[PDB]
Amino acid sequence: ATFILRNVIEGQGVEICFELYNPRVQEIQVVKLEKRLDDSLLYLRDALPEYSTFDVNMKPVVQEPNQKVPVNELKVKMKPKPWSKRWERPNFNIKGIRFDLCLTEQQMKEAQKWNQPWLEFDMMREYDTSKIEAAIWKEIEASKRS
Amino acid sequence: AAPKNRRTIEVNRCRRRNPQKLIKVKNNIDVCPECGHLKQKHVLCAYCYEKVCKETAEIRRQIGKQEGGPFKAPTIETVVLYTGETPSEQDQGKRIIERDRKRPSWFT
Amino acid sequence: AIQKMTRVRVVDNSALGNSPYHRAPRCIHVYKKNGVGKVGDQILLAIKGQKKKALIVGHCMPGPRMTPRFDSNNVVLIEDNGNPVGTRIKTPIPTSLRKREGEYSKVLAIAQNFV
Amino acid sequence: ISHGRVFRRMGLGPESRIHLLRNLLTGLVRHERIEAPWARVDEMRGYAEKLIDYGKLGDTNERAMRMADFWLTEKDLIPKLFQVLAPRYKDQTGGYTRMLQIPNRSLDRAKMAVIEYKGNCLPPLPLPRRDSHLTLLNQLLQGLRQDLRQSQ
Amino acid sequence: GKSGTWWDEHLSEENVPFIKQLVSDEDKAQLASKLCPLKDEPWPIHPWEPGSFRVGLIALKLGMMPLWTKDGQKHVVTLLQVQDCHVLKYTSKENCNGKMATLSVGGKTVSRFRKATSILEFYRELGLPPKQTVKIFNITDNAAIKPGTPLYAAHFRPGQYVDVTAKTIGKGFQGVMKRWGFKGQPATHGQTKTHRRPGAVATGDIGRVWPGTKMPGKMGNIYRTEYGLKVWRINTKHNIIYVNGSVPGHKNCLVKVKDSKLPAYKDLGKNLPFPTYFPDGDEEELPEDLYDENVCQPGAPSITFA
RNA sequence: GCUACCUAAGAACAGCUAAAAGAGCACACCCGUCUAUGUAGCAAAAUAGUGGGAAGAUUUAUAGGUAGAGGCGACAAACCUA
RNA sequence: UCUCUUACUUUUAACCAGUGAAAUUGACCUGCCCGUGAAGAGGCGGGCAUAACACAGCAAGACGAGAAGACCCUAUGGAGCU
RNA sequence: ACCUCGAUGUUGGAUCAGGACAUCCCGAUGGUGCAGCCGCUAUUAAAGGUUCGUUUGUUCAACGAUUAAAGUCCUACGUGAUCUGAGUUCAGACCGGAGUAAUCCAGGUCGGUUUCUAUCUACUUUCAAAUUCCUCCCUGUACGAAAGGACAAGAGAAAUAAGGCCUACUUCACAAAGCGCCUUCCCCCGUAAAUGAUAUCAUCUCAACUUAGUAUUAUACCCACACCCACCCAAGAACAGGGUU
Ligand SMILES: [Mg+2]
Ligand SMILES: [Mg+2]
Ligand SMILES: [Mg+2]
Ligand SMILES: [Mg+2]
Ligand SMILES: [Mg+2]
Ligand SMILES: [Mg+2]
Ligand SMILES: [Mg+2]
Ligand SMILES: [Mg+2]
Ligand SMILES: [Mg+2]
Ligand SMILES: [Mg+2]
Ligand SMILES: [Mg+2]
Ligand SMILES: [Mg+2]
Ligand SMILES: [Mg+2]
Ligand SMILES: [Mg+2]
Ligand SMILES: [Mg+2]
Ligand SMILES: [Mg+2]
Ligand SMILES: [Mg+2]
Ligand SMILES: [Mg+2]
Ligand SMILES: [Mg+2]
Ligand SMILES: [Mg+2]
Ligand SMILES: [Mg+2]
Ligand SMILES: [Mg+2]
Ligand SMILES: [Mg+2]
Ligand SMILES: [Mg+2]
Ligand SMILES: [Mg+2]
Ligand SMILES: [Mg+2]
Ligand SMILES: [Mg+2]
Ligand SMILES: [Mg+2]
Ligand SMILES: [Mg+2]
Ligand SMILES: [Mg+2]
Ligand SMILES: [Zn+2]
């Protein structure tokens, strides 16, 4: 299991690919636990540098583990149209880009042609994980107890 | 492409009379316990299939004659009857569709 | 991967890469058996219509796992023999170049930040 | 190469295939009996299983309501599916939609099959009944079972 | 004439589960009866010799899991589970080819209803349930093992290079560019039906083509032998082998793992059981997992450099 | 009656910028610079856009005339029923 | 476009049901090497090769299919221009 | 001008390679106007590579950057029933010239339709035993007045080709590929030297023999004659292959 961390260091974007299960990892510390409107922040490479820029010596904020994990509903702008990928396509499903101050109405109208309304109701392609989740939860509980 | 000569009748016989192109003899044909009109394994009998198809068609005709116009679909179950046969007590909320013939021996 | 005819940006503090020019510096040859250049390889860079060597200190494709992924192609200039051209390196240099210690001793000494 | 991949193509693409499957599902909900090629009836049964599951999960749910409104182009079949086929299988899980194979069609000679839900007010199809428990082999098996039971 | 028949044809609705349970109990009892082969009538064990070989095993490729070492590097190991592994028969030297003896080893267990008559008769005379595949290992004379003994995955120890061979994933009738790796013509450069064509095959003076010409066809449906596979972890409870590298084949398939014949690893099995690891005569219980002196164990307290 | 020219009576050209215009983009329309498909094809000359024009040296429905030692020709030895 | 190609859909591709061609055919029981011949041999000499019969793809050869060659030459056979 | 004008498609490039040495190299020798790394001569060995680019129409030809090389010839000056004509084999035109005109240019340029459903032979993994660059103690030692640098051995990192994988990176997902990962194990005949007579010395032998001096009569996939309706499949065009406890 791996994860990529995005951060700008002296006007330069650095992306490290750590591993959740690696013998070289010392300790994993969470600075600010929060959610967003998207489960994949791969569109931060084409955004403004001030959004992906965070202080390296910031103090981690501590809170209770019962706030239902507050979600940060903050929109991020984008650089003109020299982007990396076509984020305007409906297959990515992104609700954190301001298309009003970056793209026009004709561009959205011509990009909505690749929309697949039948994919949302495919039914068979849905991965119903419930029994497997209960089984692995029982397993981890039995492993943690004794 | 164009042939330089002509194939013979021997080559034609060797090509068309080979056991690979000949129809294989299947050994899945048996008899049916009911009626008996030459059926096959893993395949339903055509006689009983035609009978149940005609019965379903008649039931659908009666339903359409009872419903009338399209776009209906009742929110209750249905039950078919025949000559006589008073409705039971557990079939009150179900739609009654009676026919005009005797009850067959293969429908219970 | 830095191959050939690639518009790379000089991140040094010399009078060649920092000077404006109507044509961006592009690579023309990679000192390797194949035409694939990774971090820590010598390449030829044409700056202001000249022929000078260069050193790859960070491309853009993700290599292994424990490695940084820069958004821009960072390249530090170098001469023939081991003497760097620039004196101040503001962009961060990855720690994967410290395994050499023999041919890039001064380049790692003139650097500042490390990731 | 199509290893571990199903989704048998029928129409001119995924959209046409989904539309044909939706039409077949609507016809199966309405008439409760449809003869069609084996792949079509197989996909229809595979989708009808999940349709029955979602209809049994609940009625006031907006997700199941939207799915029933999308997969049914006749509207009137939604209340029927929610108030007849859902309370019927309250004791069953995923055991329904029995598939039976028919010979061929009198037009292009294609492999077809007929499926239907359980119960069914229509007369049942001639099911391939197994042999009775009175034949020689069955009687010998029963005798061997009784012998091993009395010897244990 | 005689028609096709199977095992569950002339059975009632109350006999098929009974027969299934009966045959399941029968095969379970037959597998449990061959659990202690040393207490029966074992063959005399000969000491290890530098000019001799041993018999391999038959495993099942589960999946591929990452693995790390102590120096910081990351390797890849493949899971090879050994379900049921036994010896079928024994052929002498003067009956096969007059060179080296052989041993018949079978794969995992299957059913007795989908096998040939001779196969069922042989497995009834031997006393074991039928297997899926049968492999043959070329051994010497002093390594003679009595047929009918269980073979566990603990026969190998961490620190030995083995060779695993199996049937690779077939691609069917494919093109030549994906098969042999030939380059292709350009795309939209005015090309007229030639993006994936091989072109020439021979010359005009010979008047024919050579049989050793790479042409499209079937590829991948063959057995490939892999060399240089070092084991890093040996499991005892689940009997899982951790061989380094990749195994030629798909998942959930029977493989054939044996000792290596490379000249760099000639006589390196002196510290290994030459006959077969018997869990009865060892008078000791091996741990659940056998780790190597270079692989980072999961219970390591975060290794740090100095 | 297809095509070159002429004669008499008619029809066609959204919208925006309209600098006054044998102005521009651009529907329908006139012709076809290129890619890909076929050469016993849909077709004895086709399929989409990238194309030029589209208020005039433009196109078109009807009727008549100029035919081989010739007709016509904003001259291609181009056309005169594949 | 390439290094270095790849993930999907349609036409199409393989089998089932029928109408069903065109070019082309001296007959074929039709393998390879060396050498010879009207000078580039599956049918000639010496060797090597050999149970028989279909399906699914590529072009190396049978100087393969379409036009009595439009390029060179002959014709007391023609025509155009000056 | 010897079959070939009742038709032999013509220069390259993409793909595919086969054979030959008059050999660039890694394999092995002798000499040197060989002081050591740079060179030359003569022999055996073909298991491989023979780059990245520009412009001129090129098989020719010109210039920038590497290692051992950007080697040669034949295969219809290899390959258009696979691909493109940039010119070369037409109908139009322009510049210059010969010519009264017409007309023409081994003087130059702009564009100039590329058609075939495989009949026959033959093919469709031949299962495999690779090659090489750099660095580290030796090495700054033999060598000169100085540059500089090895012969050989040990170890570690790397390039091309082949055999596999999805679990970690990408194409983006009940799958398949590379941009990611593992392995690739044996040689090949030319000299340096004892004894010996013919030729009583000496003599390595197209004499009888002794050392490098022949790897190998190598090792792993895969070798059960018949239960087969139907379903599934990492197996697959049909067929065929595996499971159904
Ligand atoms: Mg990109
Ligand atoms: Mg279809
Ligand atoms: Mg290509
Ligand atoms: Mg094309
Ligand atoms: Mg064409
Ligand atoms: Mg005109
Ligand atoms: Mg105008
Ligand atoms: Mg205009
Ligand atoms: Mg003229
Ligand atoms: Mg047919
Ligand atoms: Mg003669
Ligand atoms: Mg010949
Ligand atoms: Mg002939
Ligand atoms: Mg002629
Ligand atoms: Mg004459
Ligand atoms: Mg005359
Ligand atoms: Mg005359
Ligand atoms: Mg005349
Ligand atoms: Mg002649
Ligand atoms: Mg000729
Ligand atoms: Mg001819
Ligand atoms: Mg010809
Ligand atoms: Mg030689
Ligand atoms: Mg080029
Ligand atoms: Mg040629
Ligand atoms: Mg040819
Ligand atoms: Mg062609
Ligand atoms: Mg043009
Ligand atoms: Mg054939
Ligand atoms: Mg022939
Ligand atoms: Zn019947």
Swiss-Prot record, chain A:
Signal sequence coordinates: none
rRNA-binding recorded as keyword: no
Keywords: Mitochondrion, Phosphoprotein, Ribonucleoprotein, Ribosomal protein, Transit peptide
Organism: Homo sapiens
GO terms under biological process: mitochondrial translation
GO cellular component: mitochondrial inner membrane; mitochondrial large ribosomal subunit; mitochondrion; nucleus
Protein name, as recorded: Large ribosomal subunit protein bL19m
Residues of the full protein shown: 147 to 292 of 292
The UniProt record lists the keyword rRNA-binding: no
Protein family per UniProt: Belongs to the bacterial ribosomal protein bL19 family.
Gene name of the encoded protein: MRPL19
GO MF term set: structural constituent of ribosome
Main subcellular localisation: mitochondrion
Localization: Mitochondrion
Assembly and binders: Component of the mitochondrial large ribosomal subunit (mt-LSU). Mature mammalian 55S mitochondrial ribosomes consist of a small (28S) and a large (39S) subunit. The 28S small subunit contains a 12S ribosomal RNA (12S mt-rRNA) and 30 different proteins. The 39S large subunit contains a 16S rRNA (16S mt-rRNA), a copy of mitochondrial valine transfer RNA (mt-tRNA(Val)), which plays an integral structural role, and 52 different proteins.
UniProtKB/Swiss-Prot annotation, chain B:
Keywords attached to this entry: Mitochondrion, Ribonucleoprotein, Ribosomal protein, Transit peptide
PTM statement from Swiss-Prot or TrEMBL: MRPL32 precursor is processed by the m-AAA protease (composed of AFG3L2 and SPG7), which cleaves the N-terminal transit peptide. Cleavage by the m-AAA protease takes place prior to assembly into the large subunit, an essential step for mitochondrial ribosome (mitoribosome) assembly. Proper processing by the m-AAA protease is dependent on the zinc-binding region within the tightly folded C-terminal domain of MRPL32: zinc-dependent folding halts degradation initiated from the N-terminus and triggers the release of mature MRPL32.
Compartments, record wording: Mitochondrion
Record field: compositional bias (Basic and acidic residues): 91-103
Region listing for Disordered, in residue ranges: 86-108
Summary of the function given for this chain in its UniProt record: Component of the mitochondrial large ribosomal subunit (mt-LSU). The mitochondrial ribosome (mitoribosome) is a large ribonucleoprotein complex responsible for the synthesis of proteins inside mitochondria.
Family: Belongs to the bacterial ribosomal protein bL32 family.
Protein name as it appears in the record: Large ribosomal subunit protein bL32m
Species, as recorded: Homo sapiens (Human)
Gene giving rise to this polypeptide: MRPL32
First-to-last residue of the parent protein present: 79 to 186 of 188
Curated annotation (Swiss-Prot), chain C:
Predominant subcellular localization, coarse grouping: mitochondrion
Assembly description: Component of the mitochondrial large ribosomal subunit (mt-LSU). Mature mammalian 55S mitochondrial ribosomes consist of a small (28S) and a large (39S) subunit. The 28S small subunit contains a 12S ribosomal RNA (12S mt-rRNA) and 30 different proteins. The 39S large subunit contains a 16S rRNA (16S mt-rRNA), a copy of mitochondrial valine transfer RNA (mt-tRNA(Val)), which plays an integral structural role, and 52 different proteins. Interacts with MALSU1.
Full-sequence portion shown in this chain: 31 to 145 of 145
Gene: MRPL14
Biological role: Forms part of 2 intersubunit bridges in the assembled ribosome. Upon binding to MALSU1 intersubunit bridge formation is blocked, preventing ribosome formation and repressing translation.
Organism: Homo sapiens
Top-level division of the source organism's lineage: Eukaryota
GO molecular function terms attached to this record: RNA binding; structural constituent of ribosome
Protein name: Large ribosomal subunit protein uL14m
Any one Gene Ontology cellular component term annotated for this protein: mitochondrial inner membrane
One BP term from GO: mitochondrial translation
Subcellular location: Mitochondrion
Protein family (similarity comment): Belongs to the universal ribosomal protein uL14 family.
Keywords: Mitochondrion, Ribonucleoprotein, Ribosomal protein, Transit peptide
Curated annotation (Swiss-Prot), chain E:
Gene Ontology molecular function: RNA binding; structural constituent of ribosome
Protein source organism: Homo sapiens
Lineage: Eukaryota, Metazoa, Chordata, Craniata, Vertebrata
GO biological process: mitochondrial translation; translation
Cross-referenced PROSITE patterns: RIBOSOMAL_L3
Keyword presence, Ribosomal protein: yes
Quaternary structure annotation from Swiss-Prot or TrEMBL: Component of the mitochondrial large ribosomal subunit (mt-LSU). Mature mammalian 55S mitochondrial ribosomes consist of a small (28S) and a large (39S) subunit. The 28S small subunit contains a 12S ribosomal RNA (12S mt-rRNA) and 30 different proteins. The 39S large subunit contains a 16S rRNA (16S mt-rRNA), a copy of mitochondrial valine transfer RNA (mt-tRNA(Val)), which plays an integral structural role, and 52 different proteins.
GO CC terms of this entry: mitochondrial inner membrane; mitochondrial large ribosomal subunit; mitochondrion
Protein name stated in the entry: Large ribosomal subunit protein uL3m
Alphabetical keyword list: Disease variant, Mitochondrion, Primary mitochondrial disease, Ribonucleoprotein, Ribosomal protein, Transit peptide
Subcellular location: Mitochondrion
Family to which this protein belongs: Belongs to the universal ribosomal protein uL3 family.
